[PDB]
Design a binder for this molecule. Structure first.
Ligand SMILES: NS(=O)(=O)c1ccc(C(=O)N2CCN[C@H](Cc3ccccc3)C2)cc1
Ligand SMILES: [Zn+2]
Length: 257
């Protein structure tokens, strides 16, 4: 299959997934001198119901927190969108050291981690599986995480990790509103892009917050403590899971501010 190590990592993904060399690949470096302000961009509005939080899962290369997505209890609206988008999961990316780990970069600056909050177009489509490969099917909020003070909002997520230490492990994760993880200012950049790992579908409208959130060095250690192996095998920590930034290929990054 695919991964983040030497033989199966980002540099080699194009062999199984040709779209990796596509025209709408993510993530990107946001150059602030080259962004175009857009007055038509409405403010981002998120309205999430904590009752939709369902489950936390170790997926080998990462972990996901999944949400019930059968109705519109948890929605994203506004920004560049006419359609309402339904929350389905959030997850993080991180790096081997504090010096890197984010996927998106801003004026060449790499952050320590990045939060992704993913949604699918339920106005246009009937399911995530239908939406996933569509140009307007997915919307992901990206939040850059800067190493510094411990983030108490992250704690419930971090506390849950001891129950899903190895690949394939899953556990209930309930009564959680992930808008509590977002920065106070929702000023954003947006561009048309892709999933940042296989299958790399060019189906994502990216919403990148200009304001970062904090994470401590020890909080990052907890991410890196997660194991990629199945229970009983020799422990293989998830050291990193961030893709290198990709060519803009003439796309414009728009700013709401
Ligand atoms: N980093 S990112 O771009 O924000 C990103 C967005 C969505 C997903 C995701 O939900 N999955 C991808 C892996 N297989 C699963 C099923 C799946 C496959 C394809 C599309 C959606 C979901 C779940 C992963 C990464
Ligand atoms: Zn992601």
């Amino acid at each position: 299959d695919w991964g983040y190590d030497d033989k199966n990592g980002p540099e080699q993904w194009s062999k199984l997934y040709p779209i990796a060399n596509g025209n709408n690949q993510s993530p990107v470096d946001i150059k602030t001198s080259e962004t175009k302000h857009d007055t038509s961009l409405k403010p981002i509005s998120v309205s999430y119901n904590p009752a939709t939080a369902k489950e936390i899962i170790n997926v080998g290369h990462s972990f996901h927190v999944n949400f019930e997505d059968n109705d519109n209890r948890s929605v994203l609206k506004g920004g560049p969108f006419s359609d309402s988008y339904r929350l389905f999961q959030f997850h993080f990316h991180w790096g081997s050291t504090n010096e890197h780990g984010s996927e998106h970069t801003v004026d060449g600056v790499k952050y320590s981690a990045e939060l992704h909050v993913a949604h699918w177009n339920s106005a246009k489509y009937s399911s995530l599986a239908e939406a996933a490969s569509k140009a307007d099917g997915l919307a992901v909020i990206g939040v850059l995480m800067k190493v510094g003070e411990a983030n108490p909002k992250l704690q419930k997520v971090l506390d849950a990790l001891q129950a899903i230490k190895t690949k394939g492990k899953r556990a209930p994760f309930t009564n959680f509103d992930p808008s509590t993880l977002l920065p106070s200012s929702l000023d954003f950049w947006t561009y048309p892009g892709s999933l940042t790992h296989p299958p790399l579908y060019e189906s994502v409208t990216w919403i990148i917050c200009k304001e970062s959130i904090s994470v401590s060095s020890e909080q990052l250690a907890q991410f890196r403590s997660l194991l990629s192996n199945v229970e009983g095998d020799n422990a293989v920590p998830m050291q990193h899971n961030n893709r290198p930034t990709q060519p803009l290929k003439g796309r414009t990054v728009r700013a709401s501010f």
